[PDB]
Amino acid sequence: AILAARIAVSNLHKETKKVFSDVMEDLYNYINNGKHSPMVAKSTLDIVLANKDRLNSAIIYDRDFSYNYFGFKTLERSYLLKINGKVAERPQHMLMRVSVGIHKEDIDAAIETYNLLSERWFTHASPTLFNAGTNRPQLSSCFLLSMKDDSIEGIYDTLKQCALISKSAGGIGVAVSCIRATGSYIASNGLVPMLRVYNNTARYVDKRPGAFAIYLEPWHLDIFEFLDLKKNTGKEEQRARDLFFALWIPDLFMKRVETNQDWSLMCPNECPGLDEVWGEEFEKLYASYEKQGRVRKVVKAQQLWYAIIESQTETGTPYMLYKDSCNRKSNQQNLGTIKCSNLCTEIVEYTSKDEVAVCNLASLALNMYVTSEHTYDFKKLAEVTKVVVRNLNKIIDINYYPVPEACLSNKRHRPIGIGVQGLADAFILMRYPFESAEAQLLNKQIFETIYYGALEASCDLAKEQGPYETYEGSPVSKGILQYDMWNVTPTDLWDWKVLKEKIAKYGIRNSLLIAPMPTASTAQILGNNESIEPYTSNIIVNPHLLKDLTERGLWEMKNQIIACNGSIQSIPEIPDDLKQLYKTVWEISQKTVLKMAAERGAFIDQSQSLNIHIAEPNYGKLTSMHFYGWKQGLKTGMYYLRTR
Numbered sequence: 001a002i003l004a005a006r007i008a009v010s011n012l013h014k015e016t017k018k019v020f021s022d023v024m025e026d027l028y029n030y031i032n033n034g035k036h037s038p039m040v041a042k043s044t045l046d047i048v049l050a051n052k053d054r055l056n057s058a059i060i061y062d063r064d065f066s067y068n069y070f071g072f073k074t075l076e077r078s079y080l081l082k083i084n085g086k087v088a089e090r091p092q093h094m095l096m097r098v099s100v101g102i103h104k105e106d107i108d109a110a111i112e113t114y115n116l117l118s119e120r121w122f123t124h125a126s127p128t129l130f131n132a133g134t135n136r137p138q139l140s141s142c143f144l145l146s147m148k149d150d151s152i153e154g155i156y157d158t159l160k161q162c163a164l165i166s167k168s169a170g171g172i173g174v175a176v177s178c179i180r181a182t183g184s185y186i187a188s189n190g191l192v193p194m195l196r197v198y199n200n201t202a203r204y205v206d207k208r209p210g211a212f213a214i215y216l217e218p219w220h221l222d223i224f225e226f227l228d229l230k231k232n233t234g235k236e237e238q239r240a241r242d243l244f245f246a247l248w249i250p251d252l253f254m255k256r257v258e259t260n261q262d263w264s265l266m267c268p269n270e271c272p273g274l275d276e277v278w279g280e281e282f283e284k285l286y287a288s289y290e291k292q293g294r295v296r297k298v299v300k301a302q303q304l305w306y307a308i309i310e311s312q313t314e315t316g317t318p319y320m321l322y323k324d325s326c327n328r329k330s331n332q333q334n335l336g337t338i339k340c341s342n343l344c345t346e347i348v349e350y351t352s353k354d355e356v357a358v359c360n361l362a363s364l365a366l367n368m369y370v371t372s373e374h375t376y377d378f379k380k381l382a383e384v385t386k387v388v389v390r391n392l393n394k395i396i397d398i399n400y401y402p403v404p405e406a407c408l409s410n411k412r413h414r415p416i417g418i419g420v421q422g423l424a425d426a427f428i429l430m431r432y433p434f435e436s437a438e439a440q441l442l443n444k445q446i447f448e449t450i451y452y453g454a455l456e457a458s459c460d461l462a463k464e465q466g467p468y469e470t471y472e473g474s475p476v477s478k479g480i481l482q483y484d485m486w487n488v489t490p491t492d493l494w495d496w497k498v499l500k501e502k503i504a505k506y507g508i509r510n511s512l513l514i515a516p517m518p519t520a521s522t523a524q525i526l527g528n529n530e531s532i533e534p535y536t537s538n539i540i541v542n543p544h545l546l547k548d549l550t551e552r553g554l555w556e557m558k559n560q561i562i563a564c565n566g567s568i569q570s571i572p573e574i575p576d577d578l579k580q581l582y583k584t585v586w587e588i589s590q591k592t593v594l595k596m597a598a599e600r601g602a603f604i605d606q607s608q609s610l611n612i613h614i615a616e617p618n619y620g621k622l623t624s625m626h627f628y629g630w631k632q633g634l635k636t637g638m639y640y641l642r643t644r
């Protein structure tokens with residue numbers, strides 16, 4: 001497979017022009033019909049030709065050879081622009097296009113970005129990679145919204161918003177608690193038939209079928225029916241299988257589950273405003289409605305708990321979000337109550353009828369900052385973060401917004417989401433088992449570093465461009481950073497005092513900064529394990545384990561690993577230090593996974609797309625897992641449940 005990739009990359013170089021500007025000209029002048037349909041933007045081309053000598057000479061075509069086989073084949077499929085079904089763009093062409101698309105006339109910045117991207121220190125999000133240096137550059141990854149109104153008018157205005165966004169390659173998170181339930185007066189069919197409309201809309205507007213995550217609060221009267229919608233067994237009229245499901249969960253629910261108290265299901269039209277308040281304020285409003293008997297049904301909290309867990313055991317959903325933790329520990333709390341997260345559970349941004357929140361995303365490749373000394377290069381990590389911040393910050397200003405509420409929101413608050421990939425690789429390269437105390441300090445210190453670098457850059461930008469419009473009155477404005485909100489003290493690695501002085505002086509440019517996304521595609525391209533996830537299995541054979549065994553002349557063996565679905569724990573010849581290092585996710589404590597998410601979480605001002613891998617799950621296991629996560633203060637307690 002090593003040789004296979006070289007052949008493939010070579011073949012592509014043979015079948016492509018070498019000069020970057022020639023490929024940019026071909027792409028612009030592209031003609032179908034016989035209509036001039038440019039595959040790149042006029043502005044970008046005008047700039048590329050104006051700086052063609054420096055831009056064409058900046059590019060290092062040997063870097064195309066760094067891509068592994070499957071990563072390279074992913075690129076050809078989706079990321080390299082095609083003329084007439086044939087690839088015109090080399091990967092380096094695409095990165096420079098991306099680089100110039102973001103940085104425009106600033107050639108020094110564009111080449112700085114080019115070099116960082118082609119050496120794979122970090123990557124931008126797929127939509128950026130697709131559309132940067134193009135007409136209608138939709139570079140932002142996903143979106144969040146609230147139902148406009150509890151009316152056919154608002155419901156259908158929101159459906160159109162979703163259709164327009166989904167057509168322009170956006171994933172969606174949708175808050176739907178404010179919509180009235182089944183059997184309810186109109187001066188109502190309720191939620192399930194409304195969601196069927198959204199479901200068919202996702203199918204209709206792709207090619208990848210539209211990706212809509214539906215967020216419901218567990219007090220909603222339709223909650224039990226919500227939980228059935230993803231089940232592969234039922235009547236077509238009672239189901240919606242192309243949608244994705246999330247619960248937006250108050251502390252009060254979990255408290256009453258824990259104490260085996262009653263739980264009241266309410267109609268939002270009768271019991272308004274529950275999604276516009278959080279914590280104590282919610283608990284007062286909710287209690288007060290119970291005491292007014294504005295309550296459509298009463299169940300044991302534990303009966304709803306069981307149905308939540310039944311649902312997850314069957315489908316792996318719903319996603320578990322902790323509303324109160326999300327709102328309490330958000331720099332956006334000055335804007336009002338946050339009603340949902342997004343498609344991937346990592347983004348925690350404010351929505352209103354006027355505002356559709358946007359996810360501007362990138363990921364740092366944590367593998368790259370380990371030295372041959374087996375030391376982590378935190379300084380370099382922070383330097384690259386600063387660049388990504390400047391890049392994402394520019395993306396807000398150049399992005400083509402599919403609805404104007406997305407534009408108003410992103411410009412008002414300027415949130416970004418910087419993530420990571422290769423966490424499990426960085427541990428392996430430092431010789432630290434994922435669960436080890438050593439991995440645990442490094443986990444902490446990586447995200448401390450990321451958050452520090454991010455803030456510094458965002459502060460530098462605020463010095464230059466002034467603070468974001470809603471900055472005054474946010475927790476950061478009063479000297480409160482994310483770790484403060486968790487009552488955590490950082491390690492001695494970075495000087496926060498110095499940073500907090502700069503922030504107090506100048507402000508910051510971005511309301512939020514950090515959000516570890518799934519990195520499902522880009523991780524594969526770059527040859528790293530996905531996001532913050534443990535090593536999923538040891539089989540191609542894993543390149544670090546392969547290398548380690550080869551070096552010890554312990555490389556039959558590919559076949560025994562296949563025999564055990566990727567474990568090397570049974571195999572007797574492999575020494576115990578390597579076994580610890582290459583435990584698969586199924587041999588790794590999820591309690592420790594959750595603890596590590598919480599520990600990082602103190603330096604994550606958004607949230608994390610945290611999957612949970614339980615091999616043989618049952619009711620108690622999932623109950624323990626959820627309550628542990630919730631009690632740790634996690635914003636996202638679970639993205640997908642994954643099982644063996």
Ligand SMILES: C[C@H](c1cccc2c1CCC2)[C@H](NS(=O)(=O)c1ccc(Cl)cc1C(N)=O)c1n[nH]c(=O)o1
Pocket residue numbers: 585586587588589590591592594613614615616620621622624625626628629
């Ligand atoms: C469900 C349970 C669990 C998860 C999260 C929090 C808590 C628990 C039990 C107490 C609190 C979880 N059990 S488990 O998932 O079945 C499991 C146990 C040990 C190992 Cl090595 C692997 C696995 C696995 N991935 O499949 C767990 N992680 N750590 C632990 O002690 O139990």
Ligand SMILES: Cc1cn([C@H]2C[C@H](O)[C@@H](COP(=O)(O)OP(=O)(O)OP(=O)(O)O)O2)c(=O)[nH]c1=O
Pocket residue numbers: 150151152153155179180185186187188189190
């Ligand atoms: C008209 C109609 C509304 N609905 C739902 C959508 C909304 O959740 C809710 C309200 O729809 P509306 O369009 O607001 O109906 P309305 O204006 O008559 O009601 P009110 O004066 O009480 O506001 O009812 C249906 O499910 N089926 C229907 O045929």
Ligand SMILES: [Mg+2]
Pocket residue numbers: 150151
């Ligand atoms: Mg109405």
